[PDB]
Amino acid sequence: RSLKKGPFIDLHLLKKVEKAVESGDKKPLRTWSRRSTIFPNMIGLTIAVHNGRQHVPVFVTDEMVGHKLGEFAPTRTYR
Amino acid sequence: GQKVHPNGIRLGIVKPWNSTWFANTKEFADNLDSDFKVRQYLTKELAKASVSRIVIERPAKSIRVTIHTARPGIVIGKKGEDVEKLRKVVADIAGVPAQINIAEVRKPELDAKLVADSITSQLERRVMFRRAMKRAVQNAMRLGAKGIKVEVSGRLGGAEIARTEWYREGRVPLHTLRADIDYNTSEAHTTYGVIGVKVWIFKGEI
């Protein structure tokens, strides 16, 4: 949502979005971006999101935009 | 501890205090840190120089102190300028240039901190002390006391129990609100263990 006029942008991931323009076939990249948002001008590459002990591979659909990367990488094993 | 301490509420009302200065809320903790560190420095340099108290004042862009001793000669030292070497340390601790002076304290064997400095040696050396305690009491009652007590705690008779040994005269009440008690705590270390000695003096009300 918003954030402080127009979407939140997170820079250590963005340096790859700037090169995947021009995207293609690569392994899922380790990312520590958990508060980063899935807006259509920041998405373009395969990624594995940190959960507090591992990085897990995540994928998104065309019908979702109001969400953050951490919600695709839950930190609980439950119990 | 139990049973009211003269450094407690007895000093918290109607008595004067040795540090007299002010500070703003944006640096208050470094003002209290320096007050402690300058007095902790000076009381250990002068540990054998018959010092009793040190007052602290903070004039604009300065700090000023007075040292109360029963021997001004050993504190002012060679040439009468041996206190100047202390300024260079306390001005680093305070962050401001330091002023120093001294004052002669009268009747030395009537101050609990200078009476403790007449008896702690006897426990450190492990020598007979019951007449040293008789002297400590009789000299204070000769100089101007209205009561005095001294009490040892540790290693007495080579036991393992928390036992004490004392000498008193004139009665020193602690539960009295107005009695203005002078109270020193002292301790000595030996190859047979540590030994504590407490000294309490009474001179009159208010």
Binding site: - | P16, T20, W21, F22
Partner: protein, 98 residues
């Protein structure tokens, strides 16, 4: 109507200016307006007596408000600047008024 009320925070530091607050008034002019009763604020703080648990007892402390009006009774600038950049006591704050 310009005022210059003096506020103290240690009662022993305003006990050093008790005469000089009258001498300043007799040295700057002739009318004396230093003294004034004013409402006192207790400025209280209350604290626990045990470092751990035992919230069954608390003890009370104070700093209070110590206030003197001083005031200006002289129109001349060589005296107004002496009252607006005045010295009387230590550990103080000054309330300028219109």
């Amino acid at each position: 109507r310009i005022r210059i009320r003096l506020k103290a925070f240690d009662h022993r530091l305003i006990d050093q200016a008790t005469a000089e607050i009258v001498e300043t008034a007799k040295r700057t002019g002739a009318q004396v307006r230093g003294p004034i009763p004013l409402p006192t604020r207790k400025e209280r703080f209350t604290v626990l007596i045990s470092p751990h648990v035992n919230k069954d007892a608390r003890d009370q402390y104070e700093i209070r408000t110590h206030l003197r009006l001083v005031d200006i009774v002289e129109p001349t600038e060589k005296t107004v600047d002496a009252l607006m950049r005045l010295d009387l006591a230590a550990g103080v704050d000054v309330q300028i008024s219109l």
